[PDB]
């Protein structure tokens, strides 16, 4: 029940919503090759 490619983006878009994504290994390793929980995934959202 891992998240890759399109599914991963859709999940980040739903979780982050209006906040957007943050900027300045990665998510594929944490969430696609492995399963990650919502608390990991949400760490990719901007404040």
């Amino acid at each position: 029940e891992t998240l890759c490619g399109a599914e991963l983006v859709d999940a980040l878009q739903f979780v982050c919503g209006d906040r957007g994504f943050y900027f300045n290994t990665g998510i594929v390793d944490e969430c696609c090759f492995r399963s990650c929980d919502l608390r990991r995934l949400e760490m990719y959202c901007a404040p």
């Binding site: 399109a6 957007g20 994504f21 901007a46």
Partner: protein
């Protein structure tokens, strides 16, 4: 030609359009340009948005998940060269999951100096079969242009003149197939005579100088180039930087004082991506290579007697 606007650093524009206006005065982006992840934008947000001053990007252009953007023809009408100094996984141009893009429309793009094109998973994207990339890149065998509306026979790409029974656009041959080349219903792909090689030509088809790249305002004059093949020096295209100038970022000639000012701006606050620039082998560079340390009085890399500090 002396650039009307600024040289801006590489940018990464995300989430909303607010930060995009940071590009309003750039002629050259010395770095890459990434525009991505704009989920709530709509076509109305792009109806009055244009950056006509942008002529060149030294690295790569990446567009990913920008909603409501239907064409780039108004956004980057004058983008002529993407040098590909640095690339995104071997690509100088990346158009990925641009859900609403109907056409590229980069009708002034003449040369991609290094790297390839990846245009993938753009469900509305047409005006791809109409582009002869062989006029823009040497390495077209590394292009990855798949999973677009263009894959099937629903595009019907219509080039200027067709309605009037005319072929206004130049036609070129790609592996035995002869086809009229264009970017949109109203913009042809510019194609220069074979004699011009990679230098470009004026609107009238006259060859640019051998130091030009892609386009010029007057033929056979290195002060009339839109962009340079090698280096740029105070509104002139040159093969190499002469003394007392240094080669900078693989495209421009700068003086000692410029390199020095960069070095001494990078004093306090090591953040925001700064380096104390140095001189090494007639280049102004971010840091001394391994085995060298920087002689302080003249920014010059000297080899270290024993290990470097």
């Amino acid at each position: 030609h002396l650039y009307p606007g600024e040289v801006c650093p590489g940018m990464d524009i995300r989430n909303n359009l607010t930060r995009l206006h940071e590009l309003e005065n750039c002629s050259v982006i010395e770095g890459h340009l990434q525009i991505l992840l704009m989920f709530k934008t709509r076509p109305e947000d792009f109806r009055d948005l244009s950056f006509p001053k942008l002529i060149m990007i030294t690295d790569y252009l990446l567009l990913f998940r920008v909603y409501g953007l239907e064409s780039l023809k108004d956004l980057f009408p004058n983008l002529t060269v993407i040098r590909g100094s640095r690339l995104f996984f071997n690509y100088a141009l990346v158009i990925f999951e641009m859900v609403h893009l109907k056409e590229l429309g980069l009708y002034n793009l003449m040369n991609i100096t290094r790297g390839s094109v990846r245009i993938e998973k753009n469900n509305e994207l047409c005006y791809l079969a109409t582009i002869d990339w062989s006029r823009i890149l040497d390495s077209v065998e590394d292009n990855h242009i798949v999973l677009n509306k263009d894959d099937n026979e629903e595009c019907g790409d219509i080039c200027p003149g067709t309605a009037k029974g005319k072929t206004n656009c130049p036609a070129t041959v790609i592996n035995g197939q002869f086809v009229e080349r264009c970017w949109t219903h109203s913009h042809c792909q510019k194609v220069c005579p074979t004699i011009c090689k990679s230098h470009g030509c004026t609107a009238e088809g006259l060859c640019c100088h051998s130091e030009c790249l892609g386009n010029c305002s007057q033929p056979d004059d290195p002060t009339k180039c839109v962009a340079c093949r090698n280096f740029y020096l105070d509104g002139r295209c040159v093969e190499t930087c002469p003394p007392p100038y240094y080669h900078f970022q693989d495209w421009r000639c700068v003086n000692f004082s410029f390199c020095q000012d960069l070095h001494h701006k990078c004093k306090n606050s090591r953040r925001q991506g700064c380096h104390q620039y140095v001189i090494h082998n007639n280049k102004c560079i971010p840091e001394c290579p391994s085995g060298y340390t920087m002689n302080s009085s003249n920014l010059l890399c000297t080899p270290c007697l024993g290990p470097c500090p």
